[PDB]
């Protein structure tokens, strides 16, 4: 579950990206970037529940 | 030195150009340098600087002026590679005197040609002498001293 401000969002996650950019001497990382893309997950439960479907 | 020597007195010769004095004096040199072309790198890990190769040796073109000669050897050798790509390089000497006339330092240009022929526009409002320019190309020096 992901939420920042008016933000909601439920689902999994598909790809990441991690690249690393500066290093103390030692070889110890202190800046690094990552790109991150996810995916929607409903339950079958619910979606019925939000298709309400209705001569029947 | 502990005086250092002017720079307005020196010597411009040709090799392969049939020789006339008139064709040894000019009004000014220049191009007489060189430089080194690099390369950068930064290594994860080192934070003081950034590191730096050599890769190539470059030179300027070298370009002399002097006042209109109309019989010029130099020239008529200019035209050959001008009007009809016939390209046949010289070698050059650059002389710095000293003030018995004798040569305090030269440079050694090797296996040069021309690529630029110029001369200065004309006006009929203002009094001045006619201008002539030579470009040429070269591929490295050498100096003796």
């Known amino acids: 579950m992901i939420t920042w401000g008016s933000l909601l969002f439920k689902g999994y996650l598909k790809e990441m990206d991690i690249e690393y950019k500066l290093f103390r001497p030692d070889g110890t990382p202190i800046r690094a970037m990552a790109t991150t893309k996810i995916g929607e997950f409903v339950e079958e439960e619910l979606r019925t529940a939000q298709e309400n479907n209705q001569p029947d | ?145």
């Open chain 2, 1 to 145: 030195t502990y005086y250092p020597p002017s720079s307005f007195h020196f010597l411009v010769e040709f090799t392969g150009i049939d020789a006339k004095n008139n064709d040894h004096e000019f009004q000014s040199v220049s191009g007489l340098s060189v430089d080194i072309d690099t390369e950068e790198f930064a290594e994860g890990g080192e934070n003081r600087f950034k590191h730096k190769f050599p890769v190539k040796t470059k030179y300027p073109n070298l370009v002399l002026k002097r006042g209109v000669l109309v019989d010029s050897k130099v020239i008529s050798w200019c035209r050959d590679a001008i009007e009809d790509f016939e390209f046949k390089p010289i070698d050059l000497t650059v002389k710095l005197l000293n003030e018995e006339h004798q040569p305090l330092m030269t440079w050694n240009v090797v296996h040069a040609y021309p690529v630029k022929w110029s001369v200065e526009d004309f006006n009929a409002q203002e009094s001045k002498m006619a201008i002539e320019s030579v470009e040429l190309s070269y591929n490295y020096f050498k100096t003796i001293v």
